Amino acid sequence: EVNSFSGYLKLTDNVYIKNADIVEEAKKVKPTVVVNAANVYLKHGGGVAGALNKATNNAMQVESDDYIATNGPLKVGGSCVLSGHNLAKHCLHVVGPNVNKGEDIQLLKSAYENFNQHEVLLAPLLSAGIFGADPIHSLRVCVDTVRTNVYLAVFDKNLYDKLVSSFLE
């Protein structure tokens, strides 16, 4: 079965959300596209990006270093398409702003705009966690910006509940 997402809550006609680890979702679903919460040099050192790279047994990092050698770094708000390895057909590496490191929150709209080049995606909540954006704001930007079908995996039941309550106000 293709893109067999289960147990998601439909928020809008094109945005779905689940309390789940994106790595476990990718292994089960093998979506056409999994989004990585990347940085501009594609160094997958921790958090979501480190977890996805480890699930590929470091194949993602070697491919990412060869992409950077030939093409140079991404811009904040930008993206590139590389292999999905064992997790998906493709990985869309998207750079959201890191507000904790002084980057502009307005670039979160540009970051989500990359999703619109793909019909269906499994994705994390961009710029949340240690990137420092307000996660309720990130969900609002996602809902207002993405027009293709996005399945958001948020690996924290406390945050999941706060996000759904906020959306349903």
Ligand X SMILES: CC(C)[C@H](Nc1ncnc2[nH]c(-c3ccc(=O)n(C)c3)cc12)c1ccc2c(c1)S(=O)(=O)CCC2
Interface with ligand X by CB under 6 A: which residues? 21-23, 37, 47-48, 51, 124-125, 128-131, 135, 153-156, 159
Distance, CA of 42 to CA of 67 (rounded, Å): 9
Q: Using the minimum distance from each CB to ligand X, give the nearer residue, 56 or 69.
A: 56
Please, what is the minimum distance in Å from the beta carbon of residue 96 to ligand X? Answer: 7
Distance, CA of 37 to CA of 52 (rounded, Å): 10
DSSP symbol at 2: -
Please, what is the minimum distance in Å from the beta carbon of residue 150 to ligand X? Answer: 13
| Contact in structure between 141 and 108 (CB atoms under 8 Å) | yes
Please, what is the minimum distance in Å from the beta carbon of residue 169 to ligand X? Answer: 20
Query: 45 exposed, middle or buried (CB, 10 Å; 0-12, 13-18, 19+)?
Result: exposed
Q: Using the minimum distance from each CB to ligand X, give the nearer residue, 70 or 156.
A: 156
DSSP symbol at 99: G
Please, what is the minimum distance in Å from the beta carbon of residue 158 to ligand X? Answer: 9
Q: Using the minimum distance from each CB to ligand X, give the nearer residue, 67 or 154.
A: 154
Q: Using the minimum distance from each CB to ligand X, give the nearer residue, 113 or 156.
A: 156
| Contact in structure between 79 and 114 (CB atoms under 8 Å) | yes
Distance, CA of 79 to CA of 100 (rounded, Å): 20
Q: Using the minimum distance from each CB to ligand X, give the nearer residue, 37 or 88.
A: 37
Please, what is the minimum distance in Å from the beta carbon of residue 151 to ligand X? Answer: 11
